[PDB]
Design a protein around this ligand. Structure first.
Ligand SMILES: OC[C@H]1O[C@@H](O[C@H]2[C@H](O)[C@@H](O)[C@H](O[C@H]3[C@H](O)[C@@H](O)[C@H](O)O[C@@H]3CO)O[C@@H]2CO)[C@H](O)[C@@H](O)[C@@H]1O
Ligand SMILES: [Cl-]
Ligand SMILES: [Cu+2]
Length: 235
């Protein structure tokens, strides 16, 4: 149970984005139905009044929280991966539009899931803004909590993989467009009951065997991190 509070751009806090530049849902409950329209941008997908200006190559940091800013972030039980996707905003997230910029699942070196490291990072994970066409975009940050993912939601709707989905409105101003954005995958649609990484038993199956759901990270993607960029306590 987690939500995005706002974003940072090059370590500069853009301020509380909830219902402002984040298409915030009404609460932190997960999406679990893989064929739900709610898989696009969570249960209240609509245009919000602001879009955060960035340039290609900026560090864009998403900041999550549980109940209040810079708290426990997400229950520690919620082990799983983190991904970020991008789509042109005029799509409203519909159709074959979502391109993956970032994946972090289980780090064998550290013996930790992405969610574990997100807690340590005070809810902060970042991407490099890619060199796509200037314009308005949706950045779809997705945490998958796997603590009930041994079941398919379609078999037992009390369980299933849990999707914490947050769409941020980002405007890319300065970009050379050296990596034009291709078509991508649909949400809902990209994840199905047979997709690797959707049904996974963290109690019985080693995390060293976990394969995150496709698609693969796009060749145009410039990377990211799970790390505290900004100190909310200094404000
Ligand atoms: O026992 C089932 C699993 O529970 C997990 O805790 C979640 C609770 O089930 C859920 O009721 C609670 O929801 C809170 C939410 O956290 C809070 O922010 C909001 O204000 O109110 C909701 C209640 O209406 O969320 C927790 C997760 O934080 C356990 O984490 C899990 O191990 C356990 O299997
Ligand atoms: Cl839960
Ligand atoms: Cu939860």
């Amino acid at each position: 149970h987690t939500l995005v509070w706002g974003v940072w751009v090059n370590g500069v806090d853009q301020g509380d984005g909830r219902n402002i530049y984040i298409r915030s849902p009404p609460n932190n409950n997960p999406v679990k139905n893989l064929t739900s329209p709610d898989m696009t941008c969570n249960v209240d997908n609509r245009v919000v009044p602001k879009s955060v200006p960035v340039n290609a190559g900026d560090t864009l940091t998403f900041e999550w929280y549980h109940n209040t800013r810079d708290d426990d972030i997400i229950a520690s039980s919620h082990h799983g991966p983190i991904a970020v996707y991008i789509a042109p905003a005029a799509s409203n997230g519909q159709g074959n539009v979502w391109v993956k910029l970032f994946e972090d699942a289980y780090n064998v070196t550290n013996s930790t899931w992405a969610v574990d490291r997100l807690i340590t990072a005070h809810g902060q994970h970042s991407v490099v803004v890619p060199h796509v066409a200037p314009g308005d975009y949706l950045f779809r940050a997705e945490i998958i909590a796997l603590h009930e993912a041994d079941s398919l939601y379609s078999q037992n709707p009390i369980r299933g993989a849990q999707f914490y989905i947050s769409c941020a409105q980002i405007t890319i101003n300065s970009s050379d467009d050296s990596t034009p954005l291709p078509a991508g995958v649909p949400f809902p649609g990209a994840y199905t009951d047979s997709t690797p990484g959707i049904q996974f038993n963290i109690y019985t199956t080693p995390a060293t065997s976990y394969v995150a759901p496709p698609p693969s990270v796009w060749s145009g993607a410039l990377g990211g991190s799970i790390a505290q960029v900004g100190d909310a306590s200094l404000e």
